[PDB]
Amino acid sequence: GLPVLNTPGSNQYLTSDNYQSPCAIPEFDVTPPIDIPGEVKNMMELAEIDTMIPLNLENTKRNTMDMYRVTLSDSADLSQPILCFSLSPASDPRLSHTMLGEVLNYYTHWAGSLKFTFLFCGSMMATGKILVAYAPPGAQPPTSRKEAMLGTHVIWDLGLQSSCTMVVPWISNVTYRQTTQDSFTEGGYISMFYQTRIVVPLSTPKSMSMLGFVSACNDFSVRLLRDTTHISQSA
Amino acid sequence: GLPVLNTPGSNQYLTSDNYQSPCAIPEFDVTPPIDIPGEVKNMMELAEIDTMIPLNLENTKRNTMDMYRVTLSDSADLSQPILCFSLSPASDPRLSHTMLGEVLNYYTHWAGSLKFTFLFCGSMMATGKILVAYAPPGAQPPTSRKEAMLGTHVIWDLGLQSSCTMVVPWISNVTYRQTTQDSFTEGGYISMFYQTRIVVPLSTPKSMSMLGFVSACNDFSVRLLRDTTHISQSA
Amino acid sequence: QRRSRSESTIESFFARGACVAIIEVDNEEPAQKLFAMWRITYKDTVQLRRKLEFFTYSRFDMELTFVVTANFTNTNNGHALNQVYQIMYIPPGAPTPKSWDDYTWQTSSNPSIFYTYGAAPARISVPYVGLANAYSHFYDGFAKVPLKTDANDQIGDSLYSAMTVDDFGVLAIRVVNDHNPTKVTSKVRIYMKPKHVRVWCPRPPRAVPYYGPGVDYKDNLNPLSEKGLTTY
Amino acid sequence: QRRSRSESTIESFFARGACVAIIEVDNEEPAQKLFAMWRITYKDTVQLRRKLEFFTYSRFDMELTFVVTANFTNTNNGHALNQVYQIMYIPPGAPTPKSWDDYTWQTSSNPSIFYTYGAAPARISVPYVGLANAYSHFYDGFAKVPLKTDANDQIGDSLYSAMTVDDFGVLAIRVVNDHNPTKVTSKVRIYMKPKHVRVWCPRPPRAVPYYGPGVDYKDNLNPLSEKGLTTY
Numbered sequence A, B: 001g002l003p004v005l006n007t008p009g010s011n012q013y014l015t016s017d018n019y020q021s022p023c024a025i026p027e028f029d030v031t032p033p034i035d036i037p038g039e040v041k042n043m044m045e046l047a048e049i050d051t052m053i054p055l056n057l058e059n060t061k062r063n064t065m066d067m068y069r070v071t072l073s074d075s076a077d078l079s080q081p082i083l084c085f086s087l088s089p090a091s092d093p094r095l096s097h098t099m100l101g102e103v104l105n106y107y108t109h110w111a112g113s114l115k116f117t118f119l120f121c122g123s124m125m126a127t128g129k130i131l132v133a134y135a136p137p138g139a140q141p142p143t144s145r146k147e148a149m150l151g152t153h154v155i156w157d158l159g160l161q162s163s164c165t166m167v168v169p170w171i172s173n174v175t176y177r178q179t180t181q182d183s184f185t186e187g188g189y190i191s192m193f194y195q196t197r198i199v200v201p202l203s204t205p206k207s208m209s210m211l212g213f214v215s216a217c218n219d220f221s222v223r224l225l226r227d228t229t230h231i232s233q234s235a
Numbered sequence C, D: 001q002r003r004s005r006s007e008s009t010i011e012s013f014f015a016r017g018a019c020v021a022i023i024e025v026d027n028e029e030p031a032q033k034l035f036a037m038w039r040i041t042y043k044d045t046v047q048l049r050r051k052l053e054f055f056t057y058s059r060f061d062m063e064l065t066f067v068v069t070a071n072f073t074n075t076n077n078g079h080a081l082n083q084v085y086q087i088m089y090i091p092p093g094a095p096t097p098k099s100w101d102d103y104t105w106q107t108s109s110n111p112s113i114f115y116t117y118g119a120a121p122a123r124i125s126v127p128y129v130g131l132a133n134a135y136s137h138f139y140d141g142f143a144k145v146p147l148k149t150d151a152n153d154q155i156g157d158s159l160y161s162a163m164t165v166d167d168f169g170v171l172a173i174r175v176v177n178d179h180n181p182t183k184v185t186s187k188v189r190i191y192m193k194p195k196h197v198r199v200w201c202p203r204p205p206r207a208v209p210y211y212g213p214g215v216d217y218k219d220n221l222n223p224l225s226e227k228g229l230t231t232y
């Protein structure tokens, strides 16, 4: 009949190909769909959802309910930071297992701005200021308030607003960063310090707990789907 | 379905074929390009760039910085030539490793006019005339000025202009010459002689050095891509 | 906005073929595995299961690809001619083979694929065959309710989160060829590719190893690793 | 002007498929090479490397072709059935196989090719997957900078001209078939063809043998041969 030439690649099965195949059950009356609430059209929609961060991962606190709580206090050392973590939304232990990190660990490349929401869960009689800073990579990780001050930062008054949104804008040499620990696509650092203090009156708890949430912004995007390392199966 | 006939050549892999293949990473958002300076659209653009010639390839001078310098002097023998080399832009040792020759050694056929620029790097108090001659093949390689005179040639006054451009036009029996030593596609010869002398005053260096550069003209073209013999890998 | 999300779409997220089953079929002189029945599901493997359980409800047309790999078993110089494998789909209710030469292999109305070894992997497509309007990865309920008037507790006893015992049937795989004097053992790997996927009610991903067809967890319940509070 | 430059174009200059890797995969009774992981790069070979390093920056869509050649190893009369080879792409971050039957071979989201021996060489295409706006054949810098406050010099120590440790991942190649009683050894040769190539900042070609992934030179540093100054 029609002369044809078999090109290289014939008789191969590529798991990512998109070819038409015969139907094993022809003329099947599939059940029609209904308007079920909560339809998802993109996986980045899930990443845009804020989810709590396991900020505290000490030996006696990780893999519990205490790993999501960061202790603030009026007796704390105002010179030392409250919490510190690298801006690696897929490899950092505190961000890897978040919903954002879970979605990222299925992709090789990511690019976009992040959004960290910190919620103060103390008494209404407790007041204070917290300095939340993002430092782009290249310099020493801020070990002091005088250093973190120099980078991007926001001051958060506990008494006025119980939640603060620190948005980390997309600033990268490369158009896409890797979802794996790489010093060439390093994203930066996030640090927290006591701007003034936590002040509480008498008959009030002098120690409180804050929670952290991470989310992706509308500019966020991922690339090169891959297999996650989180789930394993005994063979 | 559609009757087809498998023609000869089926299931073969020709490394020079142009066939469509399945994409292993579908729906990939490739990074957009930017206007990077120095875009190259043709390989002959590189050949058109003048590059220095290892004119001197003596045992004690080759593979050094002295292999690019040709010594001129007032005490030189005015009867003997200064330098002589065949017009083989891909097989001649002095031209093979030039950028032009490097590009040619990836192709089997070449055709076009060449351009040799000779730069005098003596004192501004040194003056002289140099006869640069191209002799088309067929006759004896010019061993004297009286012979090289008879072929194409140009006189170059050192005092006036420190650089001379000897253009070798395309004159060939065949439309294309081979990039390999072949007496049937021989290109000719290039020779240099002292037209008058190098004259220098007192308190001036009596010995100077000249540099040579080779380039291809806009009419230049190459054919039948191949593998270069310059680069090898231990197996 | 110039960076796109074409690869993060639900269709692209599931556009890869995931292995869901490995089935061993042996041809030898007729305690034996001359025919193997495998119940259809993605829960025999974790990767595709975890990807699907990112959501509560799904509706997708499936694409199955069968990769058959045959080998000899202690052969000295015993050899075999190219084998043909029969993969028959048995939906719930249809009779199931009791032997490799049973009448059920006639495939009068059960769809079947006859795959010749050494050829391309056998690929077919299935539409959405769900009884409901969408697949239910998670079912917070039972199929039977124990009533006060039940004679015994076993009448209404049902597995938690189990909807139907025979979800979508089985695949029975045999070697159509008669037994060669030397044994030949083959592995059929089934790769499942969702297509035209629609999902509803996103869920957090599984954080601990799967233990059975449900949400049950037994071991390795400490996923997060040690890290300093103020360590970058 | 009637002679053309259609063959000297950048697209034509790279329009040939160059071998970039040879990978040995053995099937035998399970110190062994039942699965082989090869890091993706063109620097294992010199020809295509030299052609690409004619320029400083490049942007091209790649085409990979796999040629598999199998042979017996000291077989007396032990024979094998036609084998199927799995070539799985593992990008940076994804889990890597620790055995030939590991769960990672499920290829739930990692693209994979199942090639049947004796068929046409397996060909696929890849787009430009570069993080930056163009590939960097030469990178005059480091990835880490040693700072004054670093506890030790190893914190900031990085290889010169090395951008990322895991450039583009690896290819893991195995034989899906179980072990036949006789060993079978196969070589997979990968041929890389750039397409839609764009290049920037031309560079002089390499004149001495390559020594490693960088511009380092160790031996054979006297390329030019002897020739008389006035000898035609």
Ligand SMILES: CCCCCCCCCCCCC/C=C/[C@H](O)[C@H](N)CO
Residues within 6 Å of the ligand: A024, C040, C041, C042, C062, C087, C088, C089, C111, C112, C113, C124, C126, C129, C135, C136, C137, C167, C168
């Ligand atoms: C030889 C022809 C083969 C025909 C195969 C037809 C099998 C039909 C099964 C279709 C659906 C199986 C997988 C999808 C259902 C999921 O498990 C749902 N989440 C059910 O809980």
Ligand SMILES: CCCCCCCCCCCCC/C=C/[C@H](O)[C@H](N)CO
Residues within 6 Å of the ligand: B024, D040, D041, D042, D062, D087, D088, D089, D111, D112, D113, D124, D126, D129, D135, D136, D137, D167, D168
């Ligand atoms: C089974 C499917 C196979 C999928 C293979 C995808 C591999 C992706 C690698 C793409 C680029 C590799 C070669 C090009 C990059 C050059 O080395 C650059 N000059 C980097 O320095």
